[PDB]
Amino acid sequence: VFNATRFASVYAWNRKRISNCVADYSVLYNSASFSTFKCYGVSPTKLND
Amino acid sequence: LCFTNVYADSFVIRGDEVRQIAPGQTGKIADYNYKLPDDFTGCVIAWN
């Protein structure tokens, strides 16, 4: 998702279904590469709980 | 206005991490170096 070689053009934006897997949003949120990481119905610290 | 006690805390950081200095924020400065209380009465000042 985050380390693909190429992303979609916005007019034809891609949609991947993440499922049957464990997610560690601390690996995302601690990563200083993200110039925006804004959450809209949860706090980023709660994504792990 | 008047002030009952006053303390100025001085330090240097990356300019991206200036946000982490606000109260209730989180990340390496706000977590392991310098945390403000949630009900912080005071001001945060920063310059390049």
From Swiss-Prot, chain B:
<feature type="region of interest" description="Integrin-binding motif;">
    <location>
        <begin position="14"/>
        <end position="16"/>
    </location>
</feature>
<comment type="subunit">
    <text>Binds to host ACE2. RBD also interacts with the N-linked glycan on 'Asn-90' of ACE2. Cleavage of S generates a polybasic C-terminal sequence on S1 that binds to host Neuropilin-1 (NRP1) and Neuropilin-2 (NRP2) receptors. Interacts with host integrin alpha-5/beta-1 (ITGA5:ITGB1) and with ACE2 in complex with integrin alpha-5/beta-1 (ITGA5:ITGB1). May interact via cytoplasmic c-terminus with M protein. May interact (via N-terminus) with host bilirubin and biliverdin, thereby preventing antibody binding to the SARS-CoV-2 spike NTD via an allosteric mechanism.</text>
</comment>
<protein>
    <recommendedName>
        <fullName>Spike protein S1</fullName>
    </recommendedName>
</protein>
<comment type="function">
    <text>Attaches the virion to the cell membrane by interacting with host receptor, initiating the infection. The major receptor is host ACE2. When S2/S2' has been cleaved, binding to the receptor triggers direct fusion at the cell membrane. When S2/S2' has not been cleaved, binding to the receptor results in internalization of the virus by endocytosis using host TFRC and GRM2 and leading to fusion of the virion membrane with the host endosomal membrane. Alternatively, may use NRP1/NRP2 and integrin as entry receptors.</text>
</comment>
